[PDB]
Amino acid sequence: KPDILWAPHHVDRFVVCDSELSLYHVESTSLRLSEDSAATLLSINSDTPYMKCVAWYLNYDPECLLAVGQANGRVVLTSLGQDHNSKFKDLIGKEFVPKHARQCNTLAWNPLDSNWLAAGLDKHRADFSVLIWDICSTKPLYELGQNDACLSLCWLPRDQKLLLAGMHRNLAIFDLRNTSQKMFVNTKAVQGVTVDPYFHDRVASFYEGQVAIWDLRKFEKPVLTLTEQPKPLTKVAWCPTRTGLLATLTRDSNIIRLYDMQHTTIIERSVQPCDNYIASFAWHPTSQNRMIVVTPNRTMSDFTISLAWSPITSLMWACGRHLYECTEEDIATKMRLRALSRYGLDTEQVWRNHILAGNEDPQLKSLWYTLHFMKQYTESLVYAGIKSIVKSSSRHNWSIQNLNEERILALQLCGWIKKGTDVDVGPFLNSLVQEGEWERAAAVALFNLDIRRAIQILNEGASSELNLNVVAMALSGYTDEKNSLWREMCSTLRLQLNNPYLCVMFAFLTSETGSYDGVLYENKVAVRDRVAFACKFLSDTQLNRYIEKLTNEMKEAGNLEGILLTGLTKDGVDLMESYVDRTGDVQTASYCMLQGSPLDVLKDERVQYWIENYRNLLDAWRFWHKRAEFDIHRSKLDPSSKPLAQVFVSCNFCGKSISYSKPLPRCALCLINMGTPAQFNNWFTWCHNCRHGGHAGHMLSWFRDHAECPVSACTCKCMQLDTT
């Protein structure tokens, strides 16, 4: 049974036992034990072929000495290091043999003194198998085990004259003080003997697939029994650097069970150091919780926190005796920042809210945009949406009032048409011209059917900032022939365009009569522009179907733009829930639901729950003076959000003939009835616990100076109780 051992004085020394012993020294990074570790062999020796037992010295001088006990019973003490000045050169290679032939299973060393040699061999004919020699610095130290087989033994660490004697089917408490004094207890587990170093009186055993541990003071029955294993155990050992930790290795087992015995249930942990079952592993006595396992392919495998969150988007971490903090190099942080700019508090200029959002987001920029037109439209059916409003040329004659009144209002809401019946896009035209989005203006004029005006616009744009001129040269080809080479070619070739407005315009110019199917199903263009084109071009049934399908798609997706067509309604509520699911931003949604919702809409359970969630979040952020701002807006917009009366002065004896408008207050520090003619300094405080009160300034000064209930013969701190 090969096993891996380490030097008792050096931690960088690693050994693998076989028919040819290999000694290696660990160096930082030859065998690569780990990714950053390399082990270089010190020497190779095979002085003990077909060996059965081995041990190690109990003294630094000499070092690099390990037992070589072959099956013949001979005990050979060989040292592998560069021996030049050994403390006991006489013992180097000392040939010790037993009188009767036998095979030694396990060899252990006495810790307190190294001048003795104790080992157990096979059962003798009729004689004592357990004969221990004296190492010192031709006769043995002590012998026992008459006609008995000792599977294993070891000298106890607490007492130099203490060791364990195990019979064939029993364990005998052998005392070196008096060999005639021994106590034997019958047991089946006489193998895998392991003992905790911290718990010197605790012993353990490994017996095939069953492991039993018994206490020395109660060595009559096993204290507990380990789980039965199918594979036989390969090695049982106790980790010395970890309290209440034991390691059990099974033959042909790739996962090593590690039970936690520090409870007195035992917490068993399975460790797999490699994909191949390691024959044995060695725990580090100097390093903390370090174990090196030896794979059967001459591979040395070596194997060896608290986390939390924070309300300001921080993570706290811990490890052993160390702690760590994590911070961003976030939805919550973005919401907090949006709060930090006083976003959503605008009343005079709702247009400014999108800018107040700060970040570049078209959806939010669309979101506040839609209300801004809606805000002007108010100055209630407008909040219903495009759906409710919509519920109620074979050629292109390029060169307005014919639009329906509902269509006119829809276009006005979309931002294209200003107030009044003046159907003139010159306002939006000049606004776009100053805005710089020349392509959008060109598309709009094309929708407004001003071809040469669009030509002038594109030429002026080219006068600003090349490609635009050639695009316009293509634009000059507005031909409506059904057998068209120009339309046969450019209609396909337009796909190479980068800006999608030009491609949309080319498609519209080159599309068939009426069938503007690609017009609606364009997804990379602005929503309001598409809606306006559909309203100003499509047929009534066609427009209704297009609006319905677009609304369904927007509700299914959850895009902030869709609020404009959906409006503030139950469908608006569903869209808000969809957006919350998509992102989860509350503050934006919270104000959005507060954008003039009706009483029925404000009665939505989803809306109230979302507002309450935002309120709780705003409370947790500690932004003291800001939560009241949301409360104020809630009370202003809605009269159901009114606060309760809360405090109500009516108690004690009432009384009459003495009233303000006997007495209820008295100034404990001035004894003046309250209410007499820094305004906050003239109020009167009251004590929830101290059942007292007095002038606010007087109480403030006294509590600043004095630190007790100024209420006479009282002890309850009327203010130093919350400890803010």
Partner: protein
């Protein structure tokens, strides 16, 4: 997008558990030395400890705090088959003095935690024998009185528990407990309003490996439910509600980057990111992508 900054905190023994607070002014740390210490981050941010007490003869099993809405309350779990609730008393150094005890269960407590703050004072504990019991204090003003409202028999060794995290009126009572005793480990139990009894809803049949931690991320009033389970592999699953009410089940994600069992599952205040630390000595924090795709956006060592 997280930068790790070590905190100048030294633990004499191995950390047994950690606790925090809604305001987060102070933090509670449990050590293997059978002692409980509380460290508070100062105004400058320096975390200093001013409390030190030994809870139970055994080592600490778990520890948690309560709502800042109800004064200062701390609860602890130990392997000594007992639960202690130390309360700081300031006279001005504070003095953590136990207000009551919870040692009804003959076995060691796997974990002890409190319920949502909406419905009142209620903290429960998970027993390793598949037992969980919740005690409700009749009066807040009295801190020494606490009577068990009910009990739950998991019939399988409980490892971690997690109750209903949503304060919604429609969100009825719900409790989820994991098992580390092949079978399902996470059982969602619900206290029916009409029956006034805690009844199971469903068992997470999709998981058969032993469960280490069971937690549900911050609700923020979503339209569904999100929770995490700690086992040999980290997975993300979603619960959408339709006796017990039916629900829709779908796994949001399952990332096993740690390549080992995770000791515990953690998250963020807004539920934006859930944090998991595997047995590999690494912490994996996953963030959903803009296409509703969870991605491990944090790596720790």
């Amino acid at each position: 997008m997280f930068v790790a900054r070590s905190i100048a905190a030294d633990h004499k023994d191995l950390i047994h558990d950690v606790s925090f607070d809604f305001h987060g002014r102070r933090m509670a740390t449990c050590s293997s030395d059978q002692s409980v210490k509380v460290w508070d981050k100062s105004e400058s941010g320096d975390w200093h400890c001013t409390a030190s007490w030994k809870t139970h003869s055994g080592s600490v099993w778990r520890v948690t705090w309560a709502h800042p809405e109800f004064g200062q309350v701390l609860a602890s779990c130990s392997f000594d088959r007992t639960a202690a609730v130390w309360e700081e008393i300031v006279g001005g150094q504070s003095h953590w003095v136990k207000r009551t005890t919870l040692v009804d269960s003959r076995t060691s407590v796997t974990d002890v935690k409190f319920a949502p703050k909406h419905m009142g004072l209620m903290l429960a504990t998970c027993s390793a024998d598949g037992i969980v019991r919740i005690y409700e204090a009749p009066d807040v003003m009295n801190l020494s009185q606490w009577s068990l409202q009910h009990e739950i028999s998991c019939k399988l060794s409980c490892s971690c528990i997690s109750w209903n995290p949503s304060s919604s009126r429609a969100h009825s009572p719900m409790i989820a407990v994991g098992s580390d005793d092949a079978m399902a480990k996470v059982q969602i139990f619900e206290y029916n309003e009409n029956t006034r009894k805690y009844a199971k809803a469903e068992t997470l049949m999709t998981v058969t490996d032993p469960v280490h931690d069971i937690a549900f991320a911050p609700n923020l009033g979503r339209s569904f439910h999100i929770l995490a389970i700690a086992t040999k592999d980290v997975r993300i699953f979603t619960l959408k509600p339709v006796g017990p009410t039916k629900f829709e089940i779908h796994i949001v994600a399952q990332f096993d980057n740690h390549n080992s069992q995770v000791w515990r599952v953690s998250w963020n205040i807004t539920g934006t990111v859930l944090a998991s630390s595997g047995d590999d000595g690494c912490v994996r924090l996953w963030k959903a992508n803009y296409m509703d795709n969870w991605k491990c956006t944090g790596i720790l060592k």
